[PDB]
Amino acid sequence: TPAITLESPDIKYPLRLIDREIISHDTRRFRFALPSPQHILGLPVGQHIYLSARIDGNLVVRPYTPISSDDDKGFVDLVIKVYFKDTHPKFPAGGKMSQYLESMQIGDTIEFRGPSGLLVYQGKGKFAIRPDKKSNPIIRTVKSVGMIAGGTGITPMLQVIRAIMKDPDDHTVCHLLFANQTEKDILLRPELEELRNKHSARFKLWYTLDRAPEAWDYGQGFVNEEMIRDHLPPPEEEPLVLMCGPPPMIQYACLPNLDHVGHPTERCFVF
Ligand SMILES: Cc1cc2nc3c(=O)[nH]c(=O)nc-3n(C[C@H](O)[C@H](O)[C@H](O)COP(=O)(O)OP(=O)(O)OC[C@H]3O[C@@H](n4cnc5c(N)ncnc54)[C@H](O)[C@@H]3O)c2cc1C
Numbered sequence: 001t002p003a004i005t006l007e008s009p010d011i012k013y014p015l016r017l018i019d020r021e022i023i024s025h026d027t028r029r030f031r032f033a034l035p036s037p038q039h040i041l042g043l044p045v046g047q048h049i050y051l052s053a054r055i056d057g058n059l060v061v062r063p064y065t066p067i068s069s070d071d072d073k074g075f076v077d078l079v080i081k082v083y084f085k086d087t088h089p090k091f092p093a094g095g096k097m098s099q100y101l102e103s104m105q106i107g108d109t110i111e112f113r114g115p116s117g118l119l120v121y122q123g124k125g126k127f128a129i130r131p132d133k134k135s136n137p138i139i140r141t142v143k144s145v146g147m148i149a150g151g152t153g154i155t156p157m158l159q160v161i162r163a164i165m166k167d168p169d170d171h172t173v174c175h176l177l178f179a180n181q182t183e184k185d186i187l188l189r190p191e192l193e194e195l196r197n198k199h200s201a202r203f204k205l206w207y208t209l210d211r212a213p214e215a216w217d218y219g220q221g222f223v224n225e226e227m228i229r230d231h232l233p234p235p236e237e238e239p240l241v242l243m244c245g246p247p248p249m250i251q252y253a254c255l256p257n258l259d260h261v262g263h264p265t266e267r268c269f270v271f
Pocket of ligand 1: 048063066078081082088091093094096098099153155156271
């Protein structure tokens with residue numbers, strides 16, 4: 001009988017930072033305390049939360065999908081990539097929210113709001129997808145799910161992958177195509193490969209890198225038509241195709257190539 005954190009979609013909940021673990025040069029795991037050790041977040045699979053803060057005199061809000069689930073009591077874990085200032089020539093200021101998180105000290109609060117998102121996984125292949133906030137969800141059961149992720153776009157995918165895999169009577173097959181800049185930028189790799197080794201019948205996994213290392217058994221370059229053809233389920237299976245990554249990745253690498261392969265837009269969803 002766990003108390004729920006996100007009781008109302010219109011309340012901001014200030015949660016305290018209680019751990020900070022360095023994952024890579026620019027990525028971290030941040031753990032926040034829920035209101036009590038017995039609370040759960042209350043975040044339906046397929047949905048995300050928003051973080052909000054006053055940054056440079058304006059309210060800034062950004063979506064994040066936790067790596068924790070409603071099974072976890074008393075905490076929420078976020079994996080965050082920091083866009084550092086004075087690093088990119090065309091973006092000297094860096095990223096607003098990610099750097100706010102980066103500067104947070106133990107005990108500092110940040111406000112959570114949700115749940116949010118047009119898609120909810122209802123289990124055993126069933127997805128409930130609203131065309132917009134104001135409309136009812138369309139219910140469609142699928143045998144397989146294609147997933148294309150770039151960078152932190154992995155988190156909405158992992159959330160769904162984990163939900164499917166932990167249900168032994170969920171026979172949905174997930175095919176993930178995961179793109180990153182360099183090998184060191186592949187987030188949650190041990191977790192993904194642990195799941196693939198355990199659930200290989202239901203989980204297919206493929207990587208591509210903008211720049212690959214000398215020893216590399218996967219893809220290199222940008223996501224393209226052949227990669228989607230070979231590493232996502234065929235259009236005949238009528239899969240749902242999920243996408244999360246930088247908007248230009250969706251626009252140039254994903255949409256046109258899904259069109260080539262023959263996945264119709266009505267069976268595609270961008271987180
Ligand atoms: C459903 C969903 C789930 C998400 N889950 C996560 C998650 O789990 N973890 C996570 O970290 N993010 C996640 N994101 C992305 C997140 O919402 C933000 O887009 C991200 O944190 C960057 O926001 P920001 O305010 O820090 O940067 P912004 O202020 O929005 O600016 C960052 C943008 O400016 C440019 N830029 C600025 N600085 C740099 C730099 N140093 N190097 C290169 N480019 C730069 C880039 O184009 C970048 O896209 C998710 C997004 C969605 C839609």
